[PDB]
Ligand binder design. Structure first.
Ligand SMILES: C=CC1=C(C)[C@@H](Cc2[nH]c(/C=C3N=C(/C=C4\NC(=O)[C@H](C)[C@H]4CC)C(C)=C\3CCC(=O)O)c(CCC(=O)O)c2C)NC1=O
Ligand SMILES: C=CC1=C(C)[C@@H](Cc2[nH]c(/C=C3N=C(/C=C4\NC(=O)[C@H](C)[C@H]4CC)C(C)=C\3CCC(=O)O)c(CCC(=O)O)c2C)NC1=O
Ligand SMILES: C=CC1=C(C)[C@@H](Cc2[nH]c(/C=C3N=C(/C=C4\NC(=O)[C@H](C)[C@H]4CC)C(C)=C\3CCC(=O)O)c(CCC(=O)O)c2C)NC1=O
Ligand SMILES: C=CC1=C(C)[C@@H](Cc2[nH]c(/C=C3N=C(/C=C4\NC(=O)[C@H](C)[C@H]4CC)C(C)=C\3CCC(=O)O)c(CCC(=O)O)c2C)NC1=O
Ligand SMILES: C=CC1=C(C)[C@@H](Cc2[nH]c(/C=C3N=C(/C=C4\NC(=O)[C@H](C)[C@H]4CC)C(C)=C\3CCC(=O)O)c(CCC(=O)O)c2C)NC1=O
Ligand SMILES: C=CC1=C(C)[C@@H](Cc2[nH]c(/C=C3N=C(/C=C4\NC(=O)[C@H](C)[C@H]4CC)C(C)=C\3CCC(=O)O)c(CCC(=O)O)c2C)NC1=O
Ligand SMILES: C=CC1=C(C)[C@@H](Cc2[nH]c(/C=C3N=C(/C=C4\NC(=O)[C@H](C)[C@H]4CC)C(C)=C\3CCC(=O)O)c(CCC(=O)O)c2C)NC1=O
Ligand SMILES: C=CC1=C(C)[C@@H](Cc2[nH]c(/C=C3N=C(/C=C4\NC(=O)[C@H](C)[C@H]4CC)C(C)=C\3CCC(=O)O)c(CCC(=O)O)c2C)NC1=O
Ligand SMILES: C=CC1=C(C)[C@@H](Cc2[nH]c(/C=C3N=C(/C=C4\NC(=O)[C@H](C)[C@H]4CC)C(C)=C\3CCC(=O)O)c(CCC(=O)O)c2C)NC1=O
Ligand SMILES: C=CC1=C(C)[C@@H](Cc2[nH]c(/C=C3N=C(/C=C4\NC(=O)[C@H](C)[C@H]4CC)C(C)=C\3CCC(=O)O)c(CCC(=O)O)c2C)NC1=O
Ligand SMILES: CCC1=C(C)/C(=C/C2=NC(=C\c3[nH]c(/C=C4\NC(=O)[C@H](C)[C@H]4CC)c(C)c3CCC(=O)O)/C(CCC(=O)O)=C2C)NC1=O
Ligand SMILES: CCC1=C(C)/C(=C/C2=NC(=C\c3[nH]c(/C=C4\NC(=O)[C@H](C)[C@H]4CC)c(C)c3CCC(=O)O)/C(CCC(=O)O)=C2C)NC1=O
Lengths: 160, 161, 46, 49, 177, 407, 164, 177, 177
């Protein structure tokens, strides 16, 4: 979160928190009412955000679901959508934490080692998160879509 | 860190005697299998990622250590596994070439089971993974070479237990 | 909530510190061979 | 460059060795001496150390 | 009961494995000296009627209170049983040398022998010496260094079967201690 | 109906072994039938004679030098005019069965020896013995055994063709009838001269009393304690030699048990038992994260099925098919083998292994604290500051006696 | 474990004799025959995941009705257990070639199988369609040697004779 | 063993009383719903061969390590053995429901099952899970709320016999814990 | 046993040949009569299998209430434990005879024996009879005045070893009284 790494920043520097750090912990907690509303929208829209998320993913990447693709059959396609439910969950954590620190140490650190070791095309799962982003930002206003989309594209950046 | 030749020289040196017929008798036995070990270490270097991918999918891929709460849930924790399994398949390759498991306890076994208990890593699932990794290694290098590479896997599993 | 929790800090942590007691590499507490036996009070002739 | 010392990040993240141990092993590594030891002189290597 | 083939089966069932190329080199080397093992059992069972009188009477000349009255080799019925369990133990050790694993030793011979010898009042420390003279004889017969009868053999090393039969008598001497 | 009929009903027409004896511990070890053939070699007559002397004398040293009254009863059997039932009746009427198991035996030790020798089982209830007590005291011992082997029990489960054996019959009509069985037929070593203690009470191993344990278990309903049914035990002799992950064989009792080791072990087996009851309510539905999308990822993936081998050409390459039952669901070899690796990777099974592993370590550590006053202790632990107090002044538990002098 | 050792040390132990020349001669057969039957224990181990894959789908190609609801192979989890069981029967045949007899089959797979397949309503004829497909997929000098194909098949149709 | 009539007889023989009219109001009410007890225990016995396979395999889906090699329900002997005591317990509970008294359960089925299952290495917490699935089924078949089979019954209440068969299943849970 | 005399360490790398800082003067003085002491313990432990069986049956045939049912030596577990404890006591006098002092006996064998035998109901008046036979047996064997068995010692004297070992047996016999 912004609270924990604004601390560990000033922790390492042998000092307390500046006004630049304490006027933002202050500014973040007054932002906390609006963050829970945004995460509350994505919380009980996972049925559509995931299922329509895998909608565009297969239309854009039919190789991964075609015979020979990693997510082929009734089995892998279920797990094919399971990971999108994971990453959609971590974005709800990042929105409430005000940072990608929850998304950092979960689903991002060493993610290329996992998916390379699973045979999954890491570029394909990046395409899946982008398809979820258009569904997510379509569910919110412009002021919110600059945030909810904002955490997806960070996940897109670290996932390639 | 001794190979079969280093261990033979040490025991023959530690009594201050020369290399008699019994010391050279084992050394000739090691040189006979010298051709087998390199080809065994050859294919294992080639299929390092494929062997580890086969072991985890065959032993602990879908068990509930893989699911939330299990010991392998987060991506950092999953990525630590294949990093961790790489050492077992790698150091076992060194023991297979050196013909002596001294390198394992020198560089792998000591402080290992005492470390997994600290992190809370399940030793039971770890040995199963190495056992499954031993099973696929016998596929590649053959039977007798698998017997050689397999002889150091369970050495890790025994001491890690 | 899973029983075999783990160690570490930051996100992806189970609420238990690293090493179960915040020590990664624990200094040992055992004595050597002959005075682990000396404390036992049974290996006296040994 | 995608370099990796997985063994050293192992033994330092667990606390099995210090940062000073992790720093010394980095210095005696071969990716170091290929970088800051081979292309230079023992004179210049001392200052870069 | 198990043998040396099916000990590595139930070890390979413990790791849900097939018996692949790693474990068969342990067993093809076991049948490589399979002619050596049968040359080692044949040295035991050919002197087995004489080894049991050699070993029980060696226990008597060390601990002569057994044949003292009130002892445990005094009554002549009670002497004839002590010649019997000298050779039932040698029957089950020779099965364990034959099978290559000490399961039949540790499920039929030693299965309750400790509470047998307490409840018969048999001295246990003299049962160690009845067993361990047969350990020192069988490692003399298998290495063919018995000091009054040499058997004919194709020459070569045999010291692994000597320590294998010494490992089966220590399994007996620890289970009844 | 998994078992159609017990062993006490005879095997009907269509089996060589009864249905309970197939999947019990009958097939593993040496407690089988060695039923005599029609005409047989005198070596094969010696095989059926050696099993009778093992069974009805209970591993006793029969001392083949004498075989004094035996060789008349042998020669009636070697002719063939004596049945194996009539041989095992005639051996139970001799003097060398009387001087072993009757001249020094209590009438509880004698009845419990005739159940092991003549029949297979143990005595089940109390009034089953009280028939055979009152039948001996009014008719005598020669009319006891004649009224003991000619009931409805022996002629069905052995007939007049086979020798008796230990009847691992699967269905046990009390559950303690398996417990007293394995406590009587005490392993492959122990004989009944040893088990009744007739040698140690004997004057030079002769004419001693055959006293009995387990007399408190036949009067009151009380089970056998587990150490007599797991250590000196025929289940160790007909052992499957499995990989049993809770190992049923008990550890030998340790010297120098401490109360500090037990008092954390009892808290550990309460920790796992309270954590097992939480984790078993969440099993198989909420522990499967891929289960929630199986209703959709099974119907998203039902598009453009391929009937022969070859299609999904995908722009003109091969990329074919497998079309089996497994790989039409996309599964692999690592997908059915994931059930075999469910001991170290499971969570509910992760608790129940260490629950029964540490309770089995508890039940031999707590039972090793039956030795109190002169026992030399030790301190194998590093004498840490963790210590429970000795606060046992007043009532803390007090099991509810609402009738204190109710009169 | 019914084997060549555990018949000559089970009959001698019931007789109370030392292992004579009749029982040392029986384990001389455990040196000549075991050169071939361990080769069929090694080829079956190194290729087990492709044999059961080629055999377990012949259970469902022959009996396609198992994927109907209410039947035995109705969902994903019950299909994976059906491939698991043919991996079990192919594992005990690998255990029986390396023991020397039918020991791991008569104790671990066969005994009690007619009571679980009737209670759980599994068709036992579907099991022998998978094993008899494996017996007829066996090319004798291509899969293994000529003699190792005799040893591997003779435990296979023994298992067929047990289930039928 | 006893039944519901002969339970109050040994209760009345402890004070040497005759069986008078104040005692017999329970027993005259016992035969007043004696049609319901046979109508209850018919529903368990008509589904008993699928009640065990619903329960022992329902223990498997909760604890899937039992079918892994090592777990105590792995081998076809062990699964046929665990199914065998699945229906021994279901036989004696249906005996106890029929007699209406728990005496036939506790001297013939449960007397010493705890010390037996310790000796075989059977995990005692998993057998409660086999019993409690059979507890939830016998109270479902009696009240006819089984979600895939309804049987024909006369209209009326039945939850007393659902409670009685529930108390005969927790005696199995308390005996082996 | 092996702490009862001191052994000099002559090789290097020991820490006791050089930085020993002592030689054990109390036990360097007991090899000044060491062969005569070692023959005396060899006179006991070569008859220790027979001395315990004669002494335990000695107090049986003088006080016959112990093998009566209800007595403390009727059952087989108690009769095996009574023959075990005399054997343990005869070993611990043979430590104290060998080491030349009773300091091994009073803490490993006698510390907490009178509280044990009243916690088990062991008759203390009969157990002191059982060691006075072994007091009288051991002075016959050390002085070589046993009636049925002699041993070929050297020519000399062994009183003041017989009265040394007789001073240990009443030291046992008053520690349980
Ligand atoms: C299958 C396993 C198996 C064995 C290992 C043997 C051993 C054995 N021996 C005896 C029985 C006996 N065993 C001994 C033996 C000895 N006493 C000594 O002082 C010596 C140390 C030792 C001989 C070497 C004696 C003396 C008896 C006789 C007891 C008696 O007759 O009362 C018994 C009790 C049998 C009986 O008397 O009914 C058994 C089980 N027999 C077996 O069936
Ligand atoms: C006081 C009485 C007394 C004895 C009777 C002997 C008995 C005896 N012999 C051996 C040692 C042995 N005992 C035998 C036995 C025999 N030799 C054969 O050739 C026959 C097969 C069989 C006699 C029939 C053998 C083969 C050895 C090994 C060495 C050898 O003799 O070649 C040992 C073990 C080693 C030892 O402790 O010294 C003992 C106690 N020693 C004694 O102290
Ligand atoms: C049916 C009965 C039966 C047997 C009795 C054995 C008989 C036997 N022994 C060996 C053969 C041998 N036996 C030995 C064993 C020994 N040599 C020594 O110097 C030691 C004293 C002893 C070790 C215990 C050795 C070293 C060989 C030769 C190497 C080998 O063949 O393994 C051989 C192979 C050579 C030959 O043709 O003779 C045979 C058949 N095998 C059987 O099938
Ligand atoms: C350990 C045991 C073991 C075996 C028994 C075989 C069994 C076997 N053979 C084939 C595969 C094959 N088997 C054959 C052989 C033949 N085809 C025929 O119809 C003739 C009867 C026979 C000629 C000798 C051929 C030609 C193929 C490849 C094409 C095919 O599947 O038929 C396959 C499918 C996987 C593969 O391609 O290899 C399997 C499991 N492999 C094993 O590992
Ligand atoms: C030791 C060796 C060994 C075996 C032989 C098997 C035998 C076996 N199979 C099953 C269990 C099963 N076996 C099958 C198998 C089949 N049903 C089908 O659709 C096909 C006809 C067939 C496979 C081709 C199914 C579907 C189950 C699950 C039954 C159920 O859930 O109702 C069970 C019950 C426990 C379980 O696994 O869930 C057992 C013991 N298991 C073993 O451990
Ligand atoms: C008269 C009353 C009576 C009973 C109540 C039952 C209970 C019972 N079960 C077994 C025997 C067994 N019982 C089990 C049972 C189980 N293992 C599990 O993991 C599950 C939790 C559980 C089944 C649901 C197993 C696996 C064995 C066999 C163990 C073996 O063969 O070694 C035995 C020993 C019999 C034998 O193995 O020969 C008995 C007495 N049988 C009876 O006769
Ligand atoms: C992991 C695998 C798995 C199973 C096998 C079942 C096992 C199972 N069944 C029931 C619950 C039940 N189980 C049955 C049993 C049956 N139904 C019938 O009609 C037949 C007679 C018999 C199957 C052959 C019945 C009758 C109920 C009561 C509810 C109902 O089904 O109508 C319960 C308790 C409540 C519940 O969780 O649903 C469980 C655990 N559940 C599982 O999660
Ligand atoms: C030989 C076998 C045999 C039987 C099977 C029963 C059959 C049976 N059941 C009931 C009759 C009944 N049975 C029930 C029981 C139930 N109804 C429900 O709603 C519940 C689901 C279930 C309780 C568990 C009820 C409520 C009646 C009507 C009241 C009564 O007659 O007791 C009756 C009396 C009315 C009639 O004649 O139909 C009879 C004969 N009796 C027998 O002699
Ligand atoms: C190191 C020193 C040392 C000892 C001296 C003994 C002392 C001793 N004896 C017994 C235990 C016993 N000791 C006896 C012995 C006797 N009772 C009699 O009536 C006879 C007079 C006498 C035999 C000579 C008996 C019968 C028991 C068992 C008590 C019982 O089970 O009721 C116990 C209890 C634990 C046990 O069962 O062993 C102890 C500590 N043990 C030791 O560790
Ligand atoms: C009522 C029954 C009854 C017995 C069982 C015996 C037992 C017995 N023996 C001795 C007394 C003795 N007991 C022995 C013991 C032995 N002598 C030997 O040669 C053997 C090696 C060993 C027995 C196995 C010795 C050496 C003496 C001393 C007297 C002597 O010189 O023999 C004493 C003590 C006498 C005394 O204190 O003065 C007793 C009670 N006597 C009895 O009155
Ligand atoms: C919270 C962060 C996080 C992630 C992301 C994660 C992923 C993860 N993905 C897996 C499998 C898988 N993942 C896929 C995924 C895909 N196939 C495709 O074609 C697509 C490109 C892609 C999805 C959009 C497939 C097919 C498998 C099964 C692979 C196999 O069975 O071999 C598995 C192994 C099975 C399991 O335990 O679920 C893990 C652990 N774990 C985590 O903790
Ligand atoms: C060369 C000898 C050697 C070994 C073996 C070694 C192991 C080692 N394994 C570690 C962690 C780990 N190891 C695992 C492993 C597993 N999880 C499971 O469920 C499986 C059973 C298992 C894979 C087989 C996991 C998940 C972690 C991360 C733990 C955490 O973040 O708390 C760590 C902590 C630091 C790090 O990974 O950077 C070390 C030091 N170090 C060594 O020097």
């Amino acid at each position: 979160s912004i609270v924990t790494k604004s601390i560990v920043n000033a922790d390492a520097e042998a000092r307390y928190l500046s006004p630049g750090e304490l006027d933002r912990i202050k500014s973040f907690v007054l932002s906390g009412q609006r963050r829970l509303r945004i995460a509350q929208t994505l919380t009980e829209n996972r049925e559509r955000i995931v299922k329509q998320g895998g909608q565009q993913l297969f239309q854009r990447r039919p190789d991964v679901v075609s015979p020979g693709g990693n997510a082929y059959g009734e089995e892998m396609t279920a797990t094919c959508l399971r990971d999108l439910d994971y990453y959609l969950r971590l974005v709800t954590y990042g929105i409430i934490a005000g940072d990608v620190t929850p998304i950092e140490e979960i689903g991002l650190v060493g993610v290329k080692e996992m998916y390379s070791a699973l045979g999954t095309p890491i570029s394909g799962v990046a395409e899946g998160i982008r398809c979820m982003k258009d569904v997510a930002c379509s569910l919110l206003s412009g002021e919110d879509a600059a945030e909810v989309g904002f955490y997806f594209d960070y996940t897109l950046a670290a996932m390639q | 860190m001794q190979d079969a030749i280093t261990s033979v020289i040490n025991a023959a040196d530690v009594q201050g005697k020369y290399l008699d017929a019994n010391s050279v008798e084992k050394l000739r036995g090691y040189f006979q299998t010298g051709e087998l070990r390199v080809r065994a270490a050859a294919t294992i270097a080639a299929n390092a990622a494929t062997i580890i991918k086969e072991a985890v999918a065959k032993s602990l891929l879908y068990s509930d250590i893989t699911r939330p709460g299990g010991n392998m849930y987060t991506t950092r924790r999953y990525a630590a596994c294949i990093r961790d399994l790489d050492y077992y398949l790698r150091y076992a390759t060194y023991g297979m070439l050196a013909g002596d498991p001294s390198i394992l306890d020198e560089r792998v076994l000591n402080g290992l089971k005492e470390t997994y208990n600290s992190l809370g890593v399940p030793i039971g699932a770890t040995i199963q993974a190495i056992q499954a990794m031993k099973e696929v290694t016998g596929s590649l290098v053959g039977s007798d070479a698998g017997k050689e590479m397999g002889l150091y896997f369970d050495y890790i599993c025994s001491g890690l237990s | 909530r899973t029983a075999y929790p783990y160690t570490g800090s930051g996100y992806g942590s189970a609420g238990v510190p690293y090493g179960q007691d915040t020590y990664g590499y624990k200094a040992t507490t055992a004595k050597s061979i002959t005075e682990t036996a000396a404390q036992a009070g049974v290996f006296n002739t040994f | 460059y995608g370099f990796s010392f997985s063994v050293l990040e192992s033994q330092v993240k667990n606390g099995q060795i210090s940062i000073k141990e992790f720093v010394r092993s980095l210095g005696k590594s071969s990716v170091y001496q290929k970088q800051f030891y081979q292309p230079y002189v023992n004179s210049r290597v001392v200052e870069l150390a | 009961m198990l043998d040396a083939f099916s000990r590595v089966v139930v070890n390979s069932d413990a790791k849900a494995a097939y018996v692949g190329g790693s474990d068969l080199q342990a067993l093809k080397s076991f049948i490589a000296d399979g002619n050596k093992r049968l040359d080692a059992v044949n040295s035991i069972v050919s002197n087995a009627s004489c080894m049991v009188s050699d070993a029980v009477s060696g226990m008597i000349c060390e601990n002569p209170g057994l044949i003292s009255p009130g002892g445990n080799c005094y009554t002549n019925r009670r002497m004839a049983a002590c010649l019997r369990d000298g050779e039932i133990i040698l029957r089950y050790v020779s099965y364990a040398l034959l099978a290559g694993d000490a399961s039949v030793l540790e499920d039929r011979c030693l299965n309750g022998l400790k509470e047998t010898y307490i409840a018969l009042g048999v001295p246990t420390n003299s049962s160690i010496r009845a067993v361990s003279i047969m350990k020192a004889q069988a490692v003399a017969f298998i290495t063919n260094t018995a000091t009054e009868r040499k058997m004919s053999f194709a020459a070569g090393d045999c010291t692994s079967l000597a320590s294998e039969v010494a490992s089966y008598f220590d399994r007996v001497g620890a289970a009844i201690s | 109906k998994v078992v159609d009929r017990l062993d006490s009903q005879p095997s009907a027409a269509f089996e060589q072994t009864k249905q309970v004896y197939t999947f019990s511990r009958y097939i593993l070890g040496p407690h089988r039938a060695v039923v005599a053939p029609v005409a047989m070699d005198p070596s094969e007559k010696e095989v059926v004679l050696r099993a009778v002397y093992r069974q009805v004398f209970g591993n006793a040293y029969i001392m083949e030098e004498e075989r004094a009254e035996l060789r008349v009863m042998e020669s009636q059997f070697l002719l063939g005019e004596l049945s194996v039932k009539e041989l095992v009746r005639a051996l139970a009427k001799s003097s060398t069965y009387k001087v072993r198991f009757f001249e020094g035996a209590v009438q509880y030790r004698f009845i419990e020896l005739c159940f092991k020798h003549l029949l297979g089982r143990a005595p089940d209830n109390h009034e089953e013995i009280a028939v055979h007590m009152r039948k001996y005291q009014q008719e005598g011992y020669d009319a006891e055994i004649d009224s003991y082997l000619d009931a409805g029990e022996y002629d069905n489960v052995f007939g007049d063709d086979t020798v008796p054996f230990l009847r691992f019959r699967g269905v046990y009509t009390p559950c303690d009838s398996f417990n007293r069985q394995c406590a009587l037929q005490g392993g492959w070593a122990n004989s009944d001269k040893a088990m009744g203690g007739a040698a140690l009470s004997g004057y030079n191993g002769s004419d001693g009393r055959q006293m009995s344990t387990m007399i408190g278990n036949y009067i009151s309903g009380k089970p056998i304690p587990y150490e007599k049914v797991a250590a000196d035990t025929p289940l160790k002799s007909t052992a499957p030699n499995w990989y049993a992950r809770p190992n049923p064989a008990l550890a030998p009792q340790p010297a120098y048990v401490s109360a500090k080791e037990i008092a954390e072990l009892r808290s550990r087996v309460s920790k796992l038992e309270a954590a097992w009851s939480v984790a078993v309510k969440q099993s198989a539905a909420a522990k499967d994260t891929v289960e929630t999308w199986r209703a959709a990822a099974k119907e998203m993936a039902a598009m453009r099925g391929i009937s022969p081998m070859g299609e999904a050409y995908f722009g003109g390459i091969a990329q074919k098919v497998d079309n089996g039952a497994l790989a039409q669901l996309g599964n692999k070899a690592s997908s059915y083998k994931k059930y075999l690796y469910a001991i170290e990777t499971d969570e509910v099974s992760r608790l129940e292994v260490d629950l029964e592993e540490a309770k089995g370590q508890l039940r031999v550590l707590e039972a090793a604290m039956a030795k109190s006053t002169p026992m030399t202790r030790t301190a194998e632990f590093k004498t840490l500051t963790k210590n429970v107090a000795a606060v046992t002044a007043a009532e803390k538990a007090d099991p509810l006696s609402k009738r204190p002098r109710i009169s | 474990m019914k084997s060549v050792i555990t018949t000559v040390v089970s009959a001698a132990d019931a007789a109370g004799r030392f292992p004579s020349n009749s029982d040392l001669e029986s384990i001389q057969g455990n040196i000549q025959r075991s050169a071939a039957r361990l080769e069929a224990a090694e080829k079956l181990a190194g290729n087990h995941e492709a044999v059961v894959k080629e055999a377990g789908d012949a259970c469902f190609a022959k009996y396609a009705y198992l994927k109907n609801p209410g039947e035995a192979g109705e969902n994903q989890e019950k299909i994976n257990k059906c491939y698991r069981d043919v991996d079990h029967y192919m594992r005990l045949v690998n255990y029986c070639l390396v023991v020397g007899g039918t020991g791991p089959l008569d104790e671990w797979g066969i005994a009690g199988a007619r009571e679980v397949y009737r209670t759980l309503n599994l068709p036992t004829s579907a099991y022998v369609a998978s094993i008899a497909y494996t017996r007829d997929r066996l090319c004798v000098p291509r899969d293994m040697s000529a003699q190792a194909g005799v040893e591997f098949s003779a435990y296979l149709d023994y298992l067929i004779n047990a289930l039928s």
